[PDB]
């Protein structure tokens, strides 16, 4: 170890602070992608929270999203556990009821410790603009896409997000 874990997260925390504090898109490639990324409790460096903005030209446009990051003590040998708030989003690869996320890059097979928290949250963002519905966690939203019913796809998502605010 937790000594090699802690010095990583401290390095990442510096890099997160520096990059997000810029308003110039050469230093901050996450402008309008990641609004904030901080540790929930300053003293507990193992839990983190991010706010992302939904990608353009998707039904997620113009709605923010809060993400939970759990860093294991064996990080970065193992991936962090990343998930949404419960009943916060509909998506092929998100099980709305729990918040659980299906992201290929967080699977034991394909995890490279080169990746950090920012590439991870970004990979979550990337996922909203492009879902893989061959292996979906929300079979119903999956079958909507898998039928090319884009009218329904954008309708139910925009519906959900709108009622989320009320």
């Amino acid at each position: 170890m937790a000594d090699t874990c802690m010095s990583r997260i401290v390095k990442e925390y510096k890099v997160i602070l520096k990059t997000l504090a810029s308003d110039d898109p050469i230093a901050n490639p996450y402008r309008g992608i990641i609004e904030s990324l901080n540790p929930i409790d300053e003293t507990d460096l193992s839990k983190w929270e991010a706010i992302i903005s939904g990608p353009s030209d998707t039904p997620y446009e113009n709605h923010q999203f809060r993400i939970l990051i759990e860093v294991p003590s064996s990080y970065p040998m193992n991936p962090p556990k990343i998930s949404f708030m419960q009943n916060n989003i509909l998506h092929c690869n998100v099980k709305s009821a729990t918040g659980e996320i299906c992201l290929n890059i967080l699977k034991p097979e394909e995890w490279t410790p080169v990746w950090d928290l920012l590439h991870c949250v970004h990979a979550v963002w990337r996922l909203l603009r492009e879902p893989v519905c061959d292996s979906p966690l929300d079979v119903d939203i999956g079958a909507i896409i898998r039928c090319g019913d884009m009218s329904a796809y954008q309708g139910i998502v925009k519906y959900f997000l709108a009622e989320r605010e009320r």
Partner: protein
């Protein structure tokens, strides 16, 4: 006074009903439009009655029936009002328009040909 959440499928006959939609736009209803079984867009008045209260997200247009029934499932509303007489080539009723599946996700299903009942349900 207190009504159940509904999921109304907006084929020709249901759009044609004389319902004062502004009265219901505020509640937990969802209107699924089967554009596959109605040629034009949905009646302009119905759209306007919902937009007027900022409840335009309560209207879902659907390219495909398979798409429409997936919505029903995911929304999981208490009622599900429809008129199967619109989706059959033979003008009569056929309970085979609603997938055998739907009883799992929805409490009450009204499939009616008669105007009074439809108006009775949507208006409680």
């Amino acid at each position: 006074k207190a009504r159940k959440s509904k999921c109304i499928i907006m084929s020709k006959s249901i759009q044609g009903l004389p319902i004062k939609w502004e009265e219901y736009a505020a509640d937990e209803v969802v209107l699924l439009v089967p554009t596959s079984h109605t040629d034009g867009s949905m009646k302009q008045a119905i759209g306007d009655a919902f937009r007027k209260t900022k409840n335009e997200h309560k209207i879902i247009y659907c390219d495909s029936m398979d798409g429409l029934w997936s919505c029903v499932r995911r929304l999981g509303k208490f009622q599900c009002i429809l008129n199967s007489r619109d989706f059959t080539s033979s003008g009569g009723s056929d309970a085979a328009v609603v997938p055998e599946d739907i009883g799992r996700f929805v409490k009450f299903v009204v499939d009616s040909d008669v105007e009074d009942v439809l108006i009775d349900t949507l208006c409680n």
